[PDB]
């Protein structure tokens with residue numbers, strides 16, 4: 001199954017989770033593409049991928065505000081061609097802030113609405129991939145069984 005991993009990250013935290021996910025999905029025998037949202041275009045983004053693992057950090061306090069590079073792609077998610085594709089969300093956050101990993105339910109709610117099949121509950125972590133290695137491992141195991 002060809003998997004795209006799309007992330008937006010300002011200090012590298014969601015980026016490190018995405019890199020770890022690529023390593024683990026790839027090792028399960030999949031063709032995996034790592035793409036930074038900064039270099040991505042939403043129109044027909046999902047074409048030829050069977051699964052899209054998307055993730056980003058949130059940057060608002062009382063309101064949810066997505067990471068600068070992922071926020072336009074989020075907005076144009078209807079253009080991506082997600083219908084009938086398998087999808088999972090991930091994010092780095094900080095529990096001191098309101099909307100702790102707010103991008104995960106927002107991406108899930110929107111991808112569900114667009115006809116994507118969300119295959120598991122999104123990963124929510126504090127800090128980077130090495131601060132909680134078991135949850136990143138466990139979530140990857142989870143998407144590998146569902147692919």
Ligand SMILES: Cc1cc2nc3c(=O)[nH]c(=O)nc-3n(C[C@H](O)[C@H](O)[C@H](O)COP(=O)(O)O)c2cc1C
Nearest residue numbers: 009010011012013014057059060093094099100101
């Ligand atoms: C102004 C500001 C707003 C933030 N808002 C949130 C938030 O709404 N939810 C959350 O989980 N974290 C929030 N954070 C914490 C960051 O999301 C966390 O440090 C960051 O996700 C790590 O991001 P990265 O993966 O993009 O490097 C905020 C941080 C700053 C400075």
